[PDB]
Design a protein around this motif. Structure first.
Motif, short mmCIF file in Angstrom:
data_model
loop_
_atom_site.label_atom_id
_atom_site.label_comp_id
_atom_site.label_asym_id
_atom_site.label_seq_id
_atom_site.Cartn_x
_atom_site.Cartn_y
_atom_site.Cartn_z
N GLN A 6 52.73 66.66 48.79
CA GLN A 6 53.69 67.16 47.82
C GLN A 6 53.78 66.22 46.62
OE1 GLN A 6 54.70 65.05 50.03
NE2 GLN A 6 56.69 64.14 49.52
N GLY A 7 54.11 66.81 45.47
CA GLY A 7 54.12 66.05 44.24
C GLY A 7 52.72 65.87 43.69
N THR A 8 52.64 65.12 42.59
CA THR A 8 51.38 64.87 41.91
C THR A 8 51.19 63.37 41.68
OG1 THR A 8 52.34 65.14 39.70
CG2 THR A 8 51.43 67.11 40.77
N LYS A 9 49.93 62.98 41.49
CA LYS A 9 49.56 61.60 41.26
C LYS A 9 48.80 61.48 39.95
CE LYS A 9 46.60 59.53 44.00
NZ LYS A 9 45.73 59.17 42.85
N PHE A 10 49.14 60.46 39.16
CA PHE A 10 48.43 60.19 37.92
C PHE A 10 47.08 59.58 38.22
CE2 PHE A 10 48.30 58.33 33.48
CZ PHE A 10 48.27 59.57 32.86
N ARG A 11 46.05 60.03 37.50
CA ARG A 11 44.69 59.59 37.79
C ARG A 11 44.55 58.09 37.58
NH1 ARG A 11 39.67 58.21 36.24
NH2 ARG A 11 37.92 59.36 37.18
N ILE A 12 43.77 57.46 38.46
CA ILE A 12 43.48 56.03 38.39
C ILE A 12 41.98 55.84 38.57
CG2 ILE A 12 45.77 55.37 39.23
CD1 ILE A 12 44.53 54.88 41.94
N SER A 13 41.56 54.57 38.51
CA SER A 13 40.14 54.25 38.60
C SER A 13 39.61 54.54 40.00
CB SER A 13 39.92 52.77 38.25
OG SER A 13 40.31 52.50 36.91
N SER A 83 40.68 47.24 39.86
CA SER A 83 41.65 47.24 38.76
C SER A 83 41.88 48.66 38.24
CB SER A 83 41.15 46.34 37.63
OG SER A 83 40.06 46.93 36.94
N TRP A 84 43.13 49.11 38.32
CA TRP A 84 43.53 50.40 37.79
C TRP A 84 44.75 50.22 36.90
CZ3 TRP A 84 45.67 48.90 42.41
CH2 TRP A 84 47.04 49.13 42.58
N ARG A 85 44.89 51.09 35.91
CA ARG A 85 45.92 50.96 34.89
C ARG A 85 47.06 51.92 35.18
NH1 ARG A 85 48.02 53.25 30.33
NH2 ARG A 85 46.69 55.11 30.34
N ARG A 86 48.27 51.37 35.29
CA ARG A 86 49.47 52.19 35.41
C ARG A 86 49.93 52.66 34.04
NH1 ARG A 86 52.50 48.42 40.01
NH2 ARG A 86 51.88 49.69 41.80
N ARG A 87 50.84 53.64 34.04
CA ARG A 87 51.40 54.12 32.78
C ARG A 87 52.24 53.04 32.10
NH1 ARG A 87 53.67 60.29 32.90
NH2 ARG A 87 52.15 61.16 34.37
N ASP A 88 52.91 52.19 32.88
CA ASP A 88 53.74 51.14 32.31
C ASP A 88 52.94 50.07 31.57
OD1 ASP A 88 54.07 50.67 35.72
OD2 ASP A 88 52.85 49.31 34.51
N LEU A 92 46.32 46.17 37.50
CA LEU A 92 46.53 45.46 38.75
C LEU A 92 45.50 45.88 39.79
CD1 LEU A 92 49.59 46.93 40.70
CD2 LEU A 92 48.45 48.12 38.84
N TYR A 93 45.37 45.05 40.82
CA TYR A 93 44.44 45.30 41.91
C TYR A 93 44.89 44.50 43.12
CZ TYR A 93 42.47 41.01 39.89
OH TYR A 93 42.30 39.75 39.37
#
Lengths: 136, 69, 224, 386
Positions: A6-13, A83-88, A92-93
């Motif tokens: 349920q819900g959605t996830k923002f794309r990451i690396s 390493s993936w980038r958050r919206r904020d 981080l990794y």
RNA sequence: GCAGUCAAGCGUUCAUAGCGACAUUGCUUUUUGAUUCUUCGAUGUCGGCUCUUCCUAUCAUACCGAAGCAGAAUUCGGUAAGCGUUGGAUUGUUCACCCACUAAUAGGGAACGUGAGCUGGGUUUAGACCGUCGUGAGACAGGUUAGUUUUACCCUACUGAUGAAUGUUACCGCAAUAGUAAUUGAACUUAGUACGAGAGGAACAGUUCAUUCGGAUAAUUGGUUUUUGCGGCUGUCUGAUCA
RNA sequence: GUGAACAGCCUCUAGUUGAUAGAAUAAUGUAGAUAAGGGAAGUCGGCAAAAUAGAUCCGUAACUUCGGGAUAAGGAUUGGC
């Protein structure tokens, strides 16, 4: 994503293609997991379907307590070590890969989780957060 | 937007800048740049690199009026 | 009373909500149907509060507290801290806790009188919890599980424990906690009772998939 | 035989040919539809790109996860000197398309416009606009007859403008003349608005506004001659291949007996004209506006100029437009800012949200300090100065 | 291989919801045959990787019709290729069988597309081993191992670039024509509602994301790092230091 | 001279400074290289590259023609005063 997510996830690396080995994060008796495919992948010639944080994949146990072997079983990613980038605005990794055993409905065969768990996984999967430990 | 401090050097980190690493001990670690991030990976004691903030604090380096109340 | 409600589609109501005797918190991404059950009986007795602790909607697991205090992790923004301060009444005092042990809800299993904490709790945090919550704390784990807060749903009128807990373990806590504890399940066989559903002194909210007689048991133990 | 396995095509067919642009400035092929009900205002505009910078703003999108939470975004600040009009031009309608039948020029054109017409400025006698500009000595029937003609005919009016090349901190010394259509009402009123706007400013206080969706016409940065792997994205041939692993193996089948135009071939890369649509403005600042980088929350004292200025660009002391996201074209190049042709309704536009913080750190390395005040404060005294 | 017509019957009761015997009419040139016309002063022979386009007998997506279509799922058909048709174990494999994802893993042509694009795994010279046959030298779609694969400095075609001549030179534009791009899914609400004594069980509208593709850039993160820019270290040589 | 060494590397005696040159130094190349996460999922076949790789101390199995396998496998140190 997938059924029950349920819900959605923002794309990451994407940092876990088909054939990766991931440390067993939960107390299911397994030691490592071997990713064979990812849910909700694409279709492109010569492209390994890759996984990421919070994604649910099926992975065999190449090294673990016996009758957890020689069969396919879904799992959920709790660490990425890529390493993936958050919206904020943070790149981080984690220190190493880690996954948790989970049937397709979304609940966990294990009881507890050792080590930090990404909150991109806790938010997307409620039962993972139910049995999660450290949250980022 | 709050003030976060570099884990190795101690300089202030602006949003969109720096990196972030999580150890096995589940303790947070923030690095302002690859210069500080890679230096941490080599297991360098930050009390011994001269341009950090913990080095200058330890040896009262340029403390000037900060040592006086 | 006992109300059957689904957040979106998941049955983990305790995960997405925190219910206490004077305040209650819910996720902001919920719909009217999930909101309708909470406001059906609460009315204007205690405020409804919409927050996102740690930038997520698992506030039930990221937050735990009682009449005398509320707990938020370090990474939470002060804007939400100010929002909860304004929304919640001044009767509750909110103090940030510095701890990387786990989510506070999983770590802390507390009530007006007693509290249960994670095995790896440190003495410095032990005093902070006792002073903020005004609650005497003891060391014990539900069935040996580290996640005491996720495997024990508790209130001042009773308590639920891990379904496969040994009989000797269940009675040992009841003496200290001064309230009976009953082994059982929730959400049609799920063993996650501490995070599956929540109880306050006048209501308990469960998932829509709870079977016929577990809800009866919940009513019996919690004196609804 | 078939392709065994079928894959999506590499590259785009409608962007061909991938040749060099005919001019360093991408011409505006189309203009927003006109309505004869609104006050006269410009449709397109001219500016110079200076680089990017980082921002923080409070996202406001109901239903999203990050509602009422801070985010970061890239924005490309574009330099803006006020644009001065030096002439107007009328476009008439023909069964073969719109045609320009007359032109009108201003009284005192700056040396920049005169410099445009000369390939060799120093050797010239500066004799441009000398015979024509003398027509104002009489009562004006020489020019007033032409402005009467643009009122009768030429149902479409485009006004000729140019930028100040000396105000911008760039060393070209020559302005960029261009045509800009108008979105006013009545062709009689359009030219009337043009007469009293010769030799005077047109700022960004009227052409664009805060939180408006605009287009970005510019010229692609050039990379010279390129192969077929990086130009299109073709798969790299295996390591064992003899005589090249950075090409396309099979150009085409035996029949047809000629190379298809749809086959990817090595050629010129970059220096194209690309029109990127639906760009949102965040800041519209003026040079006289002190502390441009300051926001209602920071209450600081600093302009938008980063430490050491923009790389390969000046210091910025005049008007600027601060648009969300990336932008076609590179630094020091003219960029055409043009009003959106369609009224956007997506619940992604119309989001009137101000910024919260603007990055002014050094863009020549690892920018660690926003203003010299905080830089001198953190480190303290140095061996220099006292 | 594909498509019809008739039609006894199956389909609880009913020829055509869906099937359909006995017969019968055609289509296809991606099977295999037969012919031997071109080529034996010679058009490089299997497969795999890469890439483009075309055709449709549509696998999925768009819009509809029919059911023994109450919902869901399914099945049959119509306009339609615009778009998308995968990752792996075995095998040289065409083929085939499994694992798994996915909306789906549809069939094909272009000298059985594509070797002066690649590889040489197989068949196909010469070395050698085993089995059968032969008295023998040797023969076998037999089984196995090792076995140099060359040239574009031409013309056209394609990809990019310049350019004389229409008084010169410069600036700003129009437009014929040619090409064209977007694509699919998931979660919430609708909604335990409609529909049925029950299992189950949606849809139009709206929101948040994502899959594949495309064009552009470089603030930010990562990579490269002959700015040898800076610091450190090894061997040797400038008498030592510095350099 | 370093170094086990007629190994590699730098120099003393001796001898050359010779094999077309100048400028920018596009693709595609030949020869060296480096790549975040995964890692042989690629390919007929890890083919090419990669890793250990010197010296000192500890420790070493199946099998055997008892001679070997065996520096097997696997661990700990190395500078300067």
């Amino acid at each position: 994503s997938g059924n029950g997510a349920q819900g959605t996830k923002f794309r990451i690396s994407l940092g876990l293609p088909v054939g990766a080995i991931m440390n067993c994060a939960d107390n299911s008796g397994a030691r490592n997991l071997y990713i064979i495919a990812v849910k909700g992948s694409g279709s492109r010639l010569n492209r390994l379907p890759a996984a990421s944080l919070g994604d649910m994949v099926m992975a065999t146990v190449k090294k673990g307590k016996p009758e957890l072997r020689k069969k396919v079983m879904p799992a959920i990613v709790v660490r990425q070590a890529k390493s993936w980038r958050r919206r904020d605005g943070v790149f981080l990794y984690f220190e190493d890969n880690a996954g948790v055993i989970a049937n397709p409905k979304g609940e966990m065969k294990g009881s507890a989780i050792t080590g930090p768990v990404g909150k991109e996984c806790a938010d997307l999967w409620p039962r993972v957060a139910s049995n999660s430990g450290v949250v980022v | 937007m709050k003030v976060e401090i570099d884990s190795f050097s101690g300089a202030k980190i602006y949003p969109g800048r720096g990196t972030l690493f999580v150890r096995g001990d589940s303790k947070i670690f923030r690095f302002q740049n690859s210069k500080s991030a890679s230096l941490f990976k080599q297991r360098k004691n930050p009390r011994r690199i001269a341009w950090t903030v913990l080095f200058r604090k330890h040896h009262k380096k340029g403390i000037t009026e900060e040592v006086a109340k | 009373m006992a109300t059957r409600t689904q957040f979106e589609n998941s049955n983990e109501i305790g995960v997405f909500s925190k219910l206490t005797n004077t305040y209650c918190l819910v996720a902001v991404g919920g719909s009217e149907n999930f909101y309708s059950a909470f406001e059906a009986e609460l009315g204007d007795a205690i405020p409804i509060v919409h927050t996102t602790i740690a930038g997520t909607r698992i506030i039930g697991r990221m937050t735990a507290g009682n009449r005398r205090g509320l707990l938020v992790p370090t990474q939470t923004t002060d804007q939400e801290l100010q929002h909860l301060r304004n929304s919640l009444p001044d009767s509750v005092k909110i103090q940030r806790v510095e701890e990387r042990l786990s989510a506070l809800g999983n770590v802390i299993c507390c009530n007006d009188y007693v509290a249960l904490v994670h095995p790896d709790i440190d003495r410095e945090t032990e005093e902070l919890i006792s002073d903020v919550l005004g609650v005497e704390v003891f060391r014990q784990t539900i069935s040996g599980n580290i996640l005491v807060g996720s495997y024990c749903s508790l209130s001042n009128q009773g308590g639920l424990v891990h379904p496969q807990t040994s009989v000797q373990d269940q009675e040992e806590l009841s003496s200290l906690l001064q309230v009976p504890l009953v082994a059982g399940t929730v959400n049609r066989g799920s063993s996650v009772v501490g995070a599956g559903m929540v109880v306050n002194d006048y209501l308990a909210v469960t998932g829509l998939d709870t079977t016929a007689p577990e809800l009866s048991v919940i009513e019996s133990i919690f004196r609804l | 035989s078939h392709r065994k396995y079928e894959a999506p095509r590499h590259g785009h067919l409608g962007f061909l040919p991938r040749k060099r642009a005919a001019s360093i400035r991408a011409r505006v092929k189309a203009f927003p539809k006109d309505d004869r009900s609104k006050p006269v205002a410009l449709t397109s505009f001219l500016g110079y790109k200076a680089g990017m910078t980082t921002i923080v703003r409070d996202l406001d999108r109901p239903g999203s996860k990050f509602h009422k939470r801070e985010v970061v975004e890239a924005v490309t600040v574009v330099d803006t000197p006020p644009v001065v009009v030096v002439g107007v031009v009328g476009y008439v309608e023909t069964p073969r398309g719109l045609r320009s039948l007359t032109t009108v020029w201003a009284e005192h054109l700056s040396d920049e416009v005169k410099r445009r017409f000369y390939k060799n400025w120093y050797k010239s006698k500066k004799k441009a606009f000398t015979k024509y500009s003398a027509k104002y000595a009489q009562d004006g029937a020489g020019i007033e007859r032409e402005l009467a003609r643009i009122k009768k005919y030429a149902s479409v009016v485009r006004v000729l403008v140019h930028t100040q090349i000396r105000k911008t901190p760039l060393a070209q010394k020559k302005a960029h003349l261009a045509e800009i259509q108008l979105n006013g009402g009545s062709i009689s009123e359009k030219v009337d608005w043009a007469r009293e706007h010769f030799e005077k400013t047109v700022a960004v206080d009227s052409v664009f506004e805060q939180n408006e969706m605009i287009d970005a016409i510019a010229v692609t940065k050039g990379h010279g001659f390129e192969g077929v792997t990086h130009r299109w994205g073709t798969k790299k041939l295996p390591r064992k291949t003899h005589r090249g692993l950075r090409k396309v193996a099979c150009i085409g089948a035996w029949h047809p007996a000629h190379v298809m135009w749809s086959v990817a071939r090595a050629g010129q890369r970059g220096y194209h004209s690309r029109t990127s649509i639906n760009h949102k403005i965040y800041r519209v600042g003026k040079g006289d506006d002190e502390a441009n980088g300051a926001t209602s929350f920071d209450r600081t004292k600093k302009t938008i100029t980063p430490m050491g200025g923009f790389v390969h660009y000046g210091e910025i002391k005049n008007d600027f437009i601060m648009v969300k996201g990336c932008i076609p074209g590179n630094r020091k190049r003219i960029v055409t800012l043009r009003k959106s042709l369609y009224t956007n309704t997506s619940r992604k536009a119309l989001e009137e949200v101000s910024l919260k913080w603007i990055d002014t750190a050094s863009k020549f390395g690892k920018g660690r300090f926003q203003t010299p005040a905080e830089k001198h404060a953190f480190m303290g005294t140095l061996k220099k100065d006292l």
